From a paper:
The human CD1 family of antigen-presenting molecules (CD1a, CD1b, CD1c, and CD1d) is structurally related to MHC class I (MHC-I) molecules with the key exception that CD1 proteins bind lipidic antigens. The CD1b cleft is much larger than the corresponding clefts of other CD1 proteins. The unusually spacious cleft allows CD1b to capture either two small lipids or particularly large lipid antigens. Recently cloned TCRs, termed PG10 and PG90, mediate autoreactivity to target cells that express CD1b, and the response was augmented by adding micromolar quantities of PG.
The affinity of the PG90 TCR and the PG10 TCR toward CD1b-endo expressed in HEK 293S cells is 99.4 and 48.1 μM, respectively. However, the placement of the PG head group was markedly altered upon PG90 TCR docking, where the PG head group is shifted by 6.0 Å and locked between the CDR3 loops. The movement of the PG head group lifts the phospholipid slightly out of the antigen-binding cleft, resulting in a displacement of the sn2 fatty acid by about 2.0 Å compared with the CD1b-PG binary crystal structure. These conformational changes are also accompanied by movement in the PG90 TCR itself, whereby the CDR3β loop was repositioned by about 7.0 Å to make favorable contacts with the PG head group.
Numbering used by the authors:
A (entry chain A): 3 to 146, 152 to 177, 181 to 199
B (entry chain B): 2 to 249
The structure:
Amino acid sequence: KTTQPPSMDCAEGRAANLPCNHSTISGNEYVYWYRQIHSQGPQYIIHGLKNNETNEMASLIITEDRKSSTLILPHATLRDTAVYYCIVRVAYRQKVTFGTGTKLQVIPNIQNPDPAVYQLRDSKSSDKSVCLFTDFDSQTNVSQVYITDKCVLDMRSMDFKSNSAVAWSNFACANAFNNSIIPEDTFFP
Amino acid sequence: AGVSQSPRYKVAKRGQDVALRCDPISGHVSLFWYQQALGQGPEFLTYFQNEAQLDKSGLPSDRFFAERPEGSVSTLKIQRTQQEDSAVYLCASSLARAQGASNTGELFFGEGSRLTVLEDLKNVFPPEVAVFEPSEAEISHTQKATLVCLATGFYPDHVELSWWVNGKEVHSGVCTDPQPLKEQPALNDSRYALSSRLRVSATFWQNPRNHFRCQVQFYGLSENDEWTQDRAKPVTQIVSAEAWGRAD
Ligand SMILES: [Cl-]
Ligand SMILES: [Cl-]
Ligand SMILES: [Cl-]
Ligand SMILES: [Cl-]
Ligand code: NA
Ligand code: NA
């Protein structure tokens, strides 16, 4: 009964708009928004009928024809990276039919990119080392010797965000991340 | 004060019976069961209003059976378990229609019960955990210190990775891979590898009294599962890797 884009990227540090379409909504039905974090169960955010709603979690904008609605997260952080389910349910029943929802990815804009590949020695071993490709801008795509995907961390108290990828083998980091285009200005100590 | 689901993770041999328990919020009359597969939304299974199972239109087959005998605690039983039953079984509870002031009419969910059906339990393995100390070049180039944790050779994908600084869990400056890597992608039921980072200030890492620990909570076999291999039973356990701060 609801349609949503399966995946979406949004800017970090900005309000995020999440669209939903429910064309055949009845007068008795409400619009509900649920959020599901990885390895967690869905969690209620907000609901509305016709009026615009606002709580400490989000804002819900329903059109006057009630055919579509928008979930607005006030300030998108890395913790807002989850699946968002827009559902519609008749006022008397409780059963919820979930669609595919929206995989929201909160992406920061790296103001000062510093791409570099570092070698990290094991805390307790010899011939045990990983490669760390880090501080590359959000436009860099890393291609999978084991290479992990891009990961965004947030040093919250430092107002700092960084991207990284890890590579290891049982080999030299200099040639570890060469399959995808790594900035030519990458520091290789 | 929430919905509890047990066990969090369940490893089942193909053909054996499984039972998944749900503890809804006290006083809630509605109980729901959902089945959720990888990259898919929760699919309705069954509904309970107190002890009466009013809707079971979502139950996949005859092997699926649910109970809520006293209108509270519910059990979802899956007989002669098949590989296609491998999913996250979610339980939800709510408190009727317009019962009480400011009743949002929301569904309260448990954290789910992940079931993984395997042909052979000989493939169940706990992870090996290693911590990789921040690079000296990283500290002098950025004044930041990234600790890398590697969880390797675990099967199935029943892990929880977390960082611990001086006995307290840290979430800031942490990024764990949203999904693991297959160590042998040309093999079925291949073991996994998972990475995570903990980025702290170089000053914080250079303190040798600061304790760092990467914890990997693994979910394997229970006590009832029989183990006849010559290696240690791959039971539900925590595997850690520790490191002190390093001055320079
Ligand atoms: Cl468990
Ligand atoms: Cl600790
Ligand atoms: Cl923290
Ligand atoms: Cl713990
Ligand atoms: Na999150
Ligand atoms: Na990172």
